[PDB]
Structure 1
């Protein structure tokens, strides 16, 4: 039906014999991730395997492969190929040894310098998407991958949306409750700045270790978000002033006053970024903590 379009995007042939030595490195929602070995040419890959029946809205699987294949960028995980295997779609990507930003924010303490360096590379990914008319809608530490060179890349395009000058705003109540911007949570028309909000939230995770209200349930977080607006930090006096300033412009209630990704890339806060090799001690720490 609309699945006819899906079957025509995919490459054909045996992924189970183009690739081997499969271990689970991850299991998200409609995403089991494996690493594997390309028997031909030798390279190591990440393959995401998704059950077709779990996703009723197949137009999102299509939109996922398209956006990734059409918006390649050094701060986005690299799409290689895809395959339909029975009741399951396999997406193949370039593997990056490293871990999730989630492992770092939950197991280590980041300094301002490291936080600024992550924020800068995420803002580069978002300025690129936003200029190509794509909103991610699911920004969070869990969708940021850090390489063993200190590479920072954005992943997980399954929720993203395309806009145009004619349909410049979206209205679907989509995202992960704790990172969602109030305009989304309260069903108003919204734009690429919802990702800036989410990025503000992720900067909170890097400070405190968790998005605000994580101990609450998802529906409660949604109410809290609708009712507080701008979240508050447990301990604001621990942050520099320019960093408080940066948060403030990421977490503005007025969409008009909230920064754009282009704007925020000029913020003085990112001037303090460490070099990205600053991040590899974190990754090592995180790997040790999760052993």
Structure 2
């Protein structure tokens, strides 16, 4: 029953006032789905991320329980949740070293550094997909980095869902653009686009308006590289497996974690000078 659901939700969310438990709020994102802030956990002295969502309920209960019971080092993990009147606040981890967008727009990554990042992102995807969660918004903006090179996937555009056109145009799979065929493989396509961001600094068609880019992806399908000859055969093979037109042929996160390209990954510490240079 209706009221028995609101009482179950009230029993699952954390006790306390998040306006008192968190301080130094700084708005980092906003859209029609909600607001994202960074904040300081008063008790722990750790920087956190907080998503605030209004009325837009039994699904909420299972979704909260799933993220509270399932943790992974390559995602910003659920820390707490609160009901503030009609709003639901979700507190999760945060990394303040910067985003992969900062790194790719400011610095040049080598194949060893791209392989390390791809591996960490693939581990996050494998975890989410095993919990029937499809991200739908994989892109460099959603990869937070720690100063030590640690990698955490976030969902600050509110796209992830347990299995309306969702995502960011340049990173969308063709089957999402043409028929909204969401599935784990759209995250693999998006990772392939993010791997292109790491080589060229941008996804394909970034110079075009986002709506035209949809028409370019729907017609071109598998995007072409500017200078493929500058890449190893193993990296090129990894990209082809991520950007396969055939959904079935496209590699899963589990399969791609076995790819020979990831075997050349440099330690995550190799990203620290890029993070530092991208920050300033």
Q: Same fold (TM over 0.5)?
A: yes
Could you tell me how far 1:29 is from its partner in structure 2? 6.3
Runs of 5+ unmatched residues, structure 1: 165-172
Partner of 1:259, secondary structure, is: coil
Q: Is the 8 A contact 1:32 1:49 kept in 2?
A: yes
Could you tell me how far 1:136 is from its partner in structure 2? 1.1
Note the alpha carbon deviations across 1:225-249, whole angstroms, 9 max, x for none: 1100001122222222211111011
Corresponding residue of 1:240: 232
Matches of 1:36 and 1:161 in 2, distance apart?
22
Note the alpha carbon deviations across 1:160-219, whole angstroms, 9 max, x for none: 56667xxxxxxxx32111111111111164421111001000001111111111122222
Structure 1 residue 197 corresponds to structure 2 residue 189: yes
Corresponding residue of 1:272: 264
The 5 Å alignment of 1:71-82 reads 71-82=70-81
Matches of 1:215 and 1:19 in 2, distance apart?
40
Corresponding residue of 1:112: 111
Q: Is the 8 A contact 2:34 2:158 kept in 1?
A: no
Partner of 1:160, secondary structure, is: coil
Partner of 1:186, secondary structure, is: helix
Matches of 1:272 and 1:103 in 2, distance apart?
23
Could you tell me how far 1:59 is from its partner in structure 2? 8.4
Cα–Cα, structure 1 residues 30 and 106, in superposed 2: closer, same or farther, change >3 Å? farther
Q: Is the 8 A contact 1:67 1:157 kept in 2?
A: no
Partner of 1:23, secondary structure, is: strand
Could you tell me how far 1:262 is from its partner in structure 2? 1.3
Cα–Cα, structure 1 residues 67 and 178, in superposed 2: closer, same or farther, change >3 Å? farther
Note the alpha carbon deviations across 1:67-108, whole angstroms, 9 max, x for none: 533431011112111223345432212232211111111111
Cα–Cα, structure 1 residues 160 and 5, in superposed 2: closer, same or farther, change >3 Å? farther
Matches of 1:286 and 1:206 in 2, distance apart?
13
Note the alpha carbon deviations across 1:36-92, whole angstroms, 9 max, x for none: 33333443323233455xxxx488876764553343101111211122334543221
Q: Is the 8 A contact 1:159 1:174 kept in 2?
A: no
The 5 Å alignment of 1:15-54 reads 15-25=18-28, 30-52=33-55
Provide the aligned length of Structure 1 versus Structure 2.
276
Partner of 2:60, secondary structure, is: helix
Matches of 1:218 and 1:238 in 2, distance apart?
28
Cα–Cα, structure 1 residues 234 and 82, in superposed 2: closer, same or farther, change >3 Å? same
Q: Is the 8 A contact 1:136 1:157 kept in 2?
A: no
Matches of 2:175 and 2:219 in 1, distance apart?
12
Cα–Cα, structure 1 residues 65 and 155, in superposed 2: closer, same or farther, change >3 Å? farther
Tell me the C-alpha RMSD between the 2 structures: 2.8
Structure 1 residue 61 corresponds to structure 2 residue 60: yes
Cα–Cα, structure 1 residues 227 and 3, in superposed 2: closer, same or farther, change >3 Å? farther
Cα–Cα, structure 1 residues 237 and 15, in superposed 2: closer, same or farther, change >3 Å? same
Cα–Cα, structure 1 residues 188 and 160, in superposed 2: closer, same or farther, change >3 Å? closer
Cα–Cα, structure 1 residues 118 and 10, in superposed 2: closer, same or farther, change >3 Å? same
Q: Is the 8 A contact 1:63 1:158 kept in 2?
A: no
Q: Is the 8 A contact 2:126 2:254 kept in 1?
A: yes
